[PDB]
Design a protein around this ligand. Structure first.
Ligand SMILES: Cc1ncc(COP(=O)(O)O)c(C/N=C(\C=C\CP(=O)(O)O)C(=O)O)c1O
Ligand SMILES: Cc1ncc(COP(=O)(O)O)c(C/N=C(\C=C\CP(=O)(O)O)C(=O)O)c1O
Ligand SMILES: Cc1ncc(COP(=O)(O)O)c(C/N=C(\C=C\CP(=O)(O)O)C(=O)O)c1O
Ligand SMILES: Cc1ncc(COP(=O)(O)O)c(C/N=C(\C=C\CP(=O)(O)O)C(=O)O)c1O
Lengths: 396, 396, 396, 396
């Protein structure tokens, strides 16, 4: 973007703004444009636009001045060629798949996918005859194999993963896949463009659920996909039909929230790590999952491709369903609810929060234990948090 | 909704509000809830909810207090059992199709479909092996035939149509289809729940593009589908995955717009009609399309199932491309752009506006003439508009 | 504004928008600019601006692109030179007085002032040694007298009045006052720029409480003063200090509200009148206050300077406190609350609603009776409203 | 507030939210309530409210559920009894003075007042016979003298000051004034409730211009006053008339901004300091004003009552008007404009920016020099900023 702005934080702030917006104003912030359509001063011009000689969004579902800003902004951050913004994370992945994976084509994902993302791939995609292979995040062999066995159209996975924050050696995978013509999409939601640059590591496309960190205020939903033009455009097209456009007001809220992106991540990155270690050492804490810790399976990878380890920490408690429950129930600061990444701290028992619809057996089918607890550290003062968490594990 | 509320207008205003909201407040208007998630006081309750003993949206992609209002409201109007709200019309149709039509199933639609709506059905759906039969709005025979030839899963069309405002004898069609187990979905966008009750006429599902009349202010996009629970819910489920969630702020904006729905429709219904006739009589006006006119092919139907005829009026001008253009360029009140149904008056030359990507020949393939002009009458004073339009033709 | 627009409604819609905004955009609606300040490209320019060679709001408290629109719009409606926008009606009157009336100066107002507006003049202004003379709206003699007795700086009154909707022969008063150098300010809140043009009738300044009709959606507060430049500017200056700036978001909501000003008024102007007559005739209705009725004291004046009679209707019920209460309690559509002018209907018993802090005696001191009812007809269907009202006018 | 909230930051986040809102919702964020009035279910209740037996804002100008939150929030932060929120800082001071200072009363303020704030006191107040004494921030003697000479009704000043960030030994002054019955009001705008607690140091009332740090995003104006009930309430009353109500939407933006208050301040507190030092050591920098520097006149006081020194840094350059201008013009990151405290960095030449209306001589009358530059460090990366400022300074 600019030769003077070299720090991500600085960018996040003035990215796609300080230099120009395309919507001239002597205002500091971006103006929220609430329009359903864009006009023309005369048929002559309209033709020009239609003939690719002028620029216009034409219809709101195709673009918005107040949105593009955030689009370029994120683009700059991830250092991408272009970025797209849907109405929600799920939308993005959804569209992305439907757009890139041809009919009858094959795809490769990890085992630690996010609940819903899984269902889509396992129930909808097959309708299009799109088959998939589910390998473990680490198991690079399986990938290399599958790469040769079938004709992979695209490899897709989130790194860190959910909720065990498992990580994929992006650079490596990227290499393998590209050797077989496969495409690589990394859901760096948990990571954040600040703690890693999937695109830089070789990944083809990187998408985020701005609902979490980017907006980081727990008050807006939004999808987001960034990558090479020739690629992202193909999706935007399909997007222009599925109509999952993002409202301006939402867009703005994200821009504003990203004004203090670095600040928020920084703090969370710490609190988490420190709180992580503290928990691991705790007797009542059976296990702790966090890329920052040395105990983490791919810690060496995290250390190699990341600069931070997110603000989400998962850990099993030394008890059972009701016991673990007792724990979270004791907490006083975090809110018991889904989502994560906002200033407000949140906690939840995945087993119940997003898997209660299954049997104890079918649950364990995917590491989901009744002890497993997911802590999304907010931005509250560390000491305040720790004391709460501690005062909690005590009640058990 | 209420016994003491019988006129549509009165409903549109107080529908799903005057009696209660679910979010207790001594405030007149509906409060805009900007949350990305909902919390619980204790694990105990969370369980209850999960076990269907308590009520909660849980996540923002699944529901919102500031949205449900609008949901119930529209439900009340269309006199439906339950309504759903997407991020945009296109979203609705899209989902609904992908949700109801099984893989390899067959569907029946009309020829006067809206551009994009067409494409989806002709390019995406086929990927799921879903075939379709395109018949003329009037051609009831073709329908009855197709009904017996293949196994129709659902009949879908808009009434009035776009842009020739063709109308489908809903009551009749409904009967035929239901005889063969097919489902009927009517896109009464142009109609508006005020000018017609497709659901009452027997239709299974009626959907609208709130972007137009419902919001009627040209500052927000929104999809909307109403109908029976057992049905709409099946969609809501898939919607919870494709994530085309509507933002609370947008929702409210519609709630506000519908506060004066009738008032707005009423005036538009007039101006349109009156202006229509004046146009038909004009020498320079080759042809005029409008259900209100006696010249309209299905006027007898329009007169039978409708109470008004929208504010949109299409008409071919006695000239050619450049000539017709010269006309619109002369106008001083309406804006030249897509969309319609807002207080502001809008005009466009479909040929260019949304078909310029095709050849003169391929264009005519669907009645789209270079003369054809689509006038979306705003809410400005009649005389002002008339004088404008006339003074415009004055130069051709 | 333009030549093609001749009806107020048409204006209210495209006033200060259709032709240009000063904030170039190809969007239909006005963009909400959320900025606290405005920048410059270089010191050179800043100087220019400071030297009145360039244009800029500099600080938000001095202006806003999204506000000025609404400013020019109202200007056009009232046919004024320039208009100002405060945070609330009260602010307007407040500022206006503090701005024009010199220290120790004298002022003349009517007896039927709005509660608070009264207190200010009776408790604050005296601090600046500003004395006042309270005359009866009709009593033109008293005015002519005072005009000669003391040295009147400005005559200020609302027409119609609150809550007895009394009316002042603007043209006449204007003439008298100006003969003595006094200024005239009319609070045409109840009237609305559509039902009368105080400025055209000679008034110096006309102010409204956009909180009511202009916004007409019961979801925003706003002051508003229109008049000649040389005058209004003197107020804007003081305004730039008292800092009662109006928020952009608020401004927009008004502009949006005014997009259907005529439509709403028109309907209310009817419902009220019709309902009024019906009420007068009713046996349980002791008295009815409404300029539209022939029974109204200044009906001949109303008929001469207005074109409509608002939507507010006051009337005493044939009972007492508890009885009148029983009436309003029976109503099902209107909301028991202050304010008025919104699509939603509202009712209140001034005696309690805004005078319960006084004694039964001190209350009657100003016509406020325990029977007095103030009905602010919404936009709901007439029949629906009437049925309701009657259904109550019988449970007594 | 609560127990589990000991750190300011933690408070700023969950202050007046985590435990309850008064507007029940299972939502994380506070819901924006856009209403102009509040209703009642029956006359009976209304009476209750009017008789102080129930609670209700009645009218929007008197309160809003979405506002009170921010109110209590700030209250908690400053550790006050109650807080009030105006439409803009200026409004606050304005109302505050007009509300507390009786007619003919006397007041004492410092010489480094903010431009506008000065004028009001020097032009309006005198209309109410309110005389004032202007002493230097440090000159306690003058204060102690005035205290005995006349009958001071209230001592008012800002600390730090603008733009020389001078500081007042709050504790001391408070002690003296309270001995003579005077009231103390501190404008801790520059400080921020995080860098100092005027109320704790003894001050009677502390006010802020949320337009700056509190909102910290340069997209909203808002005044704010906190202090003891018996006091603040007296202001809220007059405020209920001058009608300088703050809009809900605006209120929310602040609430959202304060979600990361500490984070923001922290960073700015550093950058400023560090940058300060660097500047002072610079050869081209003639002088530097910052409470954090040892060179600062009241550094020992700042060090004793503050924990931080804001992000605002003033410094004179070794050149002249045109030279200093050349400097700021060279800057690439900060915007040249008024205001300060938002994530975006801002610079300005007080001489021109807010004193160009005066003569070179009348300007110097108050330390305002053509070299004087006020830098409000944003949140961008330090190195990024430094490099800029540096590269800037060289141009000379
Ligand atoms: C890695 C990842 N990717 C994509 C999404 C979907 O993005 P969207 O929500 O903006 O559409 C989510 C959602 N994550 C959660 C939301 C879950 C909803 P559920 O808890 O299953 O009802 C969560 O709790 O962590 C996620 O964790
Ligand atoms: C009956 C009907 N239904 C549903 C939709 C789509 O709803 P959505 O836009 O909210 O997704 C439309 C769009 N109609 C138009 C919009 C077109 C977009 P274009 O102007 O072709 O780029 C139009 O003819 O003006 C329509 O005419
Ligand atoms: C003619 C008129 N002018 C100016 C104002 C004050 O402007 P603002 O409200 O926008 O600040 C009012 C308020 N009127 C009412 C509001 C009253 C509030 P209360 O009932 O005293 O609590 C009413 O008659 O219902 C009014 O009726
Ligand atoms: C200490 C202090 N107090 C109160 C106010 C007024 O609050 P409000 O702005 O929210 O009404 C200001 C304004 N400060 C500035 C605003 C100046 C306006 P200008 O552009 O100089 O006319 C500034 O430091 O640049 C201030 O610095």
């Amino acid at each position: 973007y600019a030769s003077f702005l070299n720090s991500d934080g600085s960018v996040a702030i003035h990215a796609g703004e300080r230099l120009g917006r395309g919507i001239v104003t002597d205002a500091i912030t971006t103006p929220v444009v609430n329009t359903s359509a864009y006009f023309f001063n005369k048929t002559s011009e309209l033709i020009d636009f239609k003939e690719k000689r002028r620029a216009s969004f034409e219809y709101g579902r195709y673009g918005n001045p107040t949105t593009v800003v955030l689009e370029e902004k994120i683009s700059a951050l991830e250092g991408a060629e272009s970025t797209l913004l849907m109405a929600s994370g799920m939308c993005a992945s959804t569209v992305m798949l439907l757009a890139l994976v041809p009919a009858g084509g094959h795809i490769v994902t990890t085992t630690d996918c996010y609940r819903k993302t899984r269902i889509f791939i396992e129930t909808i995609l097959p309708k299009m005859g799109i088959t998939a292979t589910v390998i473990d995040p680490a198991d690079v062999g399986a990938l290399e194999l599958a790469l040769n066995q079938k004709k992979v159209n695209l490899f897709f996975t989130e790194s860190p993963t959910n909720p065990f924050l498992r990580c994929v050696d992006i650079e490596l995978v990227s290499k393998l896949c590209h050797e077989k013509g496969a495409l690589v999409c990394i859901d760096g939601t948990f990571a954040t463009p600040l703690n890693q640059k999937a695109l830089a590591l070789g990944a083809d496309l990187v998408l985020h659920s701005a609902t979490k960190f980017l907006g980081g205020h727990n008050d807006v939903l939004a999808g987001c996909i960034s990558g090479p033009l020739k690629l992202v455009s193909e999706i935007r097209n399909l997007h222009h039909i599925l109509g999952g456009a993002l409202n301006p007001n939402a867009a703005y809220l994200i821009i504003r929230g990203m004004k203090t992106l670095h600040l928020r991540v920084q703090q969370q990155n710490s609190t988490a790590l420190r709180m992580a270690e503290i928990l691991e050492a705790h007797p009542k804490v059976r296990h702790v999952y966090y890329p920052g810790l040395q105990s983490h399976p791919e810690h060496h990878i995290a250390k190699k491709q990341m600069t931070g380890f997110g603000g989400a920490v998962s850990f099993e408690v030394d008890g059972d369903l009701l016991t673990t429950a007792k724990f979270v129930d004791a907490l006083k600061i975090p809110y018991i609810a889904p989502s994560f990444g906002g200033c407000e701290s949140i906690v939840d028992q995945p087993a119940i929060m997003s898997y209660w619809d299954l049997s104890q057996s079918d649950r364990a089918k995917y590491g989901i234990m009744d002890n497993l607890v997911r802590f999304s550290f907010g931005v509250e003062d560390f000491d305040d948090l720790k004391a709460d968490i501690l005062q909690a594990l005590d009640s058990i």
